[PDB]
Amino acid sequence: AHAFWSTQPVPQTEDETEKIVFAGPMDEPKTVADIPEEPYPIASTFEWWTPNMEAADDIHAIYELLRDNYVEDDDSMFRFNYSEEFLQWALCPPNYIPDWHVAVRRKADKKLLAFIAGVPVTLRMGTPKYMKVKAQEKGEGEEAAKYDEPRHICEINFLCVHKQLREKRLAPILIKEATRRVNRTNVWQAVYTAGVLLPTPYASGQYFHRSLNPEKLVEIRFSGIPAQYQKFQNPMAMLKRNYQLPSAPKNSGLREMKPSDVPQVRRILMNYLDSFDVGPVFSDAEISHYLLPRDGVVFTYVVENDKKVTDFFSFYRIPSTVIGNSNYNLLNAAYVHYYAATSIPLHQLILDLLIVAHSRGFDVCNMVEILDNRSFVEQLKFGAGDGHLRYYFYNWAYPKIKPSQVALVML
Ligand SMILES: CCCCCCCCCCCCCC(=O)SCCNC(=O)CCNC(=O)[C@H](O)C(C)(C)COP(=O)(O)OP(=O)(O)OC[C@H]1O[C@@H](n2cnc3c(N)ncnc32)[C@H](O)[C@@H]1OP(=O)(O)O
Ligand SMILES: CN1CC[C@H](N(C)c2nc(N(C)CCC#N)c3sc(C(C)(C)C)cc3n2)C1
Ligand SMILES: [Mg+2]
Numbered sequence: 001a002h003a004f005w006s007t008q009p010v011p012q013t014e015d016e017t018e019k020i021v022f023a024g025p026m027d028e029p030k031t032v033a034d035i036p037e038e039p040y041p042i043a044s045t046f047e048w049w050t051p052n053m054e055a056a057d058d059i060h061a062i063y064e065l066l067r068d069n070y071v072e073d074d075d076s077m078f079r080f081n082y083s084e085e086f087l088q089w090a091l092c093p094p095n096y097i098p099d100w101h102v103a104v105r106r107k108a109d110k111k112l113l114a115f116i117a118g119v120p121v122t123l124r125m126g127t128p129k130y131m132k133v134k135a136q137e138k139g140e141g142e143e144a145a146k147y148d149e150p151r152h153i154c155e156i157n158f159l160c161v162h163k164q165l166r167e168k169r170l171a172p173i174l175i176k177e178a179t180r181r182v183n184r185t186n187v188w189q190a191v192y193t194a195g196v197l198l199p200t201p202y203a204s205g206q207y208f209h210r211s212l213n214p215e216k217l218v219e220i221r222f223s224g225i226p227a228q229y230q231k232f233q234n235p236m237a238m239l240k241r242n243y244q245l246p247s248a249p250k251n252s253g254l255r256e257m258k259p260s261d262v263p264q265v266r267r268i269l270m271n272y273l274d275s276f277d278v279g280p281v282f283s284d285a286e287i288s289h290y291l292l293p294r295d296g297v298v299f300t301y302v303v304e305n306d307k308k309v310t311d312f313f314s315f316y317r318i319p320s321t322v323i324g325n326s327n328y329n330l331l332n333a334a335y336v337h338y339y340a341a342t343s344i345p346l347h348q349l350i351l352d353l354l355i356v357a358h359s360r361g362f363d364v365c366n367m368v369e370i371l372d373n374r375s376f377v378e379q380l381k382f383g384a385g386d387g388h389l390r391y392y393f394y395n396w397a398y399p400k401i402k403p404s405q406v407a408l409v410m411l
Contacts, residue, residue, distance in 0.1 A: 201392055317333070
């Protein structure tokens with residue numbers, strides 16, 4: 001069934017994952033000196049390339065590869081079009097490792113053919129709460145707590161092979177070379193997500209969408225007019241009224257985040273994320289990088305009351321190419337990023353997210369049912385989509401958990 005994934009240190013079946021009780025490594029300990037110093041072999045017509053993701057032109061080359069060859073729906077209606085500024089943001093966080101950005105090019109002319117990217121993340125990935133309770137029942141607390149310390153690991157994203165080279169077993173080679181470069185830096189675990197089912201997720205959640213511009217979404221067939229609206233004289237008018245939003249935020253202290261807010265935002269975020277079984281730990285530099293506003297990329301607002309920041313939300317922009325409809329070039333989606341609420345109900349905080357996103361010209365707001373995202377689905381008129389995001393570890397045994405015990409947002 002899986003000629004590549006069967007050879008890797010991942011759980012091989014759903015049954016295996018449902019039997020795991022404690023977090024820890026799959027493979028035997030290895031040293032850096034054990035790991036080949038030479039790049040993984042690749043066909044003579046190709047070469048490995050490490051792009052400089054802080055050079056505008058190298059970012060542009062990766063941008064083009066992904067624009068033309070990255071994730072598309074099965075009906076080929078929409079294809080992600082991450083911007084150049086987004087890619088620089090995502091692939092160069094504090095203390096990033098340039099060698100973890102791995103590309104293949106055709107040696108002759110040097111066309112870019114494939115890419116995969118790793119970035120550092122500090123993750124809590126110790127045994128989940130439910131399984132620590134069972135372990136205490138049983139006298140096994142020491143084993144259950146062994147890997148509780150937040151671990152410095154790799155997050156993988158942006159795996160892409162050019163459409164002309166699909167189904168030639170190039171993706172396994174990129175994965176193996178990325179693994180080698182990570183292992184050479186003495187890191188032995190990775191976290192990754194995909195929409196496809198691979199061996200084997202530790203968690204899975206549905207995607208949810210909230211329409212902001214229903215007329216456009218229906219036109220491009222992202223959305224349908226649902227059957228019950230046919231009881232109405234003007235279905236589209238009633239759809240628009242259904243999703244109508246305020247033109248101004250409701251929370252009076254709302255404003256964009258600024259550098260001086262970093263310590264307080266770090267504090268309330270970390271207190272919140274601490275409650276979840278899998279979640280990142282951020283430095284001040286990482287809070288600054290991932291949350292301060294960046295035009296066209298990330299948008300972050302704080303609620304400041306009596307000169308104190310008590311709540312915040314963030315969202316990021318991923319446009320998609322509208323492949324088949326010629327009336328529109330792009331789908332402009334806002335994705336829910338991190339947030340924390342201490343003064344107001346989460347639904348009140350996130351309504352202001354939708355108002356700001358709509359005001360800024362976004363067409364839809366998307367999220368996965370991680371964090372406390374299910375708490376505002378119905379009131380704020382999100383609907384489940386047909387897709388799922390599955391969360392995976394490489395070289396880490398982990399119990400199956402619910403997606404509401406996951407606090408890592410994937411870009
Ligand atoms: C310690 C450090 C560890 C670091 C590494 C951690 C692991 C990171 C793992 C990567 C995390 C990526 C996170 C993201 O970026 S998820 C986004 C993935 N990108 C896309 O969907 C973009 C459009 N599609 C493509 O570019 C290609 O179809 C890809 C590149 C996806 C596959 O190329 P292609 O279609 O030309 O096929 P092949 O003949 O080369 O290879 C076939 C093998 O590939 C397995 N496959 C298919 N899709 C995925 C997938 N999304 N993750 C992992 N494996 C995948 C498949 O089961 C088969 O293996 P097996 O079933 O035969 O065994
Ligand atoms: C949290 N994410 C942002 C990055 C990933 N992003 C952009 C992403 N991934 C998706 N899937 C399942 C496949 C992509 C891979 N691999 C979908 S489906 C989706 C709808 C339109 C609402 C149905 C939005 C969405 N967004 C997921
Ligand atoms: Mg291939």
